[PDB]
């Protein structure tokens, strides 16, 4: 979550990465962050994936 002074038409741009020793295949080692309003980085919050 990113609670800054954000106005309309503004699109935050953050990236989370993990650089650990254990390497699990790509697709999930890094994620983006666009609006930050309790953003999970996915268009769905599904735990049955």
């Amino acid at each position: 979550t990113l609670p800054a002074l954000v106005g309309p038409y503004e699109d935050i741009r953050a990236v989370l990465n993990y650089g650990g020793s254990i390497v699990m295949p790509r697709g999930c080692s890094a994620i983006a962050l666009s609006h930050g309003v309790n953003d999970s980085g996915q268009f769905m919050l599904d735990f049955n994936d």
Partner: protein
């Protein structure tokens, strides 16, 4: 009754009874939004208005 402003790809105009506004995709510069690191092929998939 009729107006036109803009260039190929990025053009607003009035044709017949309708008004058309075209946006050139390459104009939008989405490569520049995020670093080429951790991304090779970028492509659009969803549009909401």
């Amino acid at each position: 009754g009729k107006g036109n402003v803009g260039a190929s790809g990025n053009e607003l105009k009035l044709s017949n009874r309708q008004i058309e506004a075209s946006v050139r995709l390459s104009d939008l510069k989405i490569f520049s939004d995020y670093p080429e690191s951790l991304g090779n092929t970028r492509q659009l998939k969803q549009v909401s208005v």
